[PDB]
């Protein structure tokens, strides 16, 4: 029953959400965040984290993206947020890393496409 910000719309991405999944792909490391419209970073999984760093090979791999995906899935359930929105780019949405990010997320149990607002 809370507020989103319905608005902007000359700009991108759509800022209407409670929680926005954000995936930054550096030439080196894969980083995945979850954000509040306040800008605050709620739950994150990054490669430069020694945990994921030591457990696997070749950071830039599609495999490492699956990995960061389900690590953020796990950490999300622990944080009890089952709903967030993801706005990839038209070209990004076709890459393997992101499809596997989304599959890792779904198998994790986390639902994308945020539930609607009640009496908006």
């Amino acid at each position: 029953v809370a507020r989103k910000e319905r608005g902007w719309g000359t700009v991108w991405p759509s800022r209407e959400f409670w929680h926005r999944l954000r995936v930054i792909r550096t030439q080196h490391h894969i980083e995945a965040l979850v954000e509040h419209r306040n800008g605050q970073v709620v739950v994150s999984a990054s490669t430069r984290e020694w945990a994921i760093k030591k457990h696997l090979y070749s950071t830039r791999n599609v495999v490492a993206c699956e990995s960061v995906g389900r690590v953020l899935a796990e950490r999300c359930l622990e944080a009890g947020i089952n709903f967030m929105v993801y706005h990839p780019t038209p070209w990004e949405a076709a890459s393997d890393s992101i499809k596997r990010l989304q599959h890792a997320m779904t198998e994790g149990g986390v639902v994308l496409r945020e539930p609607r607002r009640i009496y908006e």
């Binding site: 910000e5 319905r6 608005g7 902007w8 719309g9 000359t10 700009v11 800022r15």
Partner: peptide
């Protein structure tokens, strides 16, 4: 341009 809570 429309900002937060402003519809176009």
């Amino acid at each position: 341009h429309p900002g937060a809570h402003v519809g176009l």
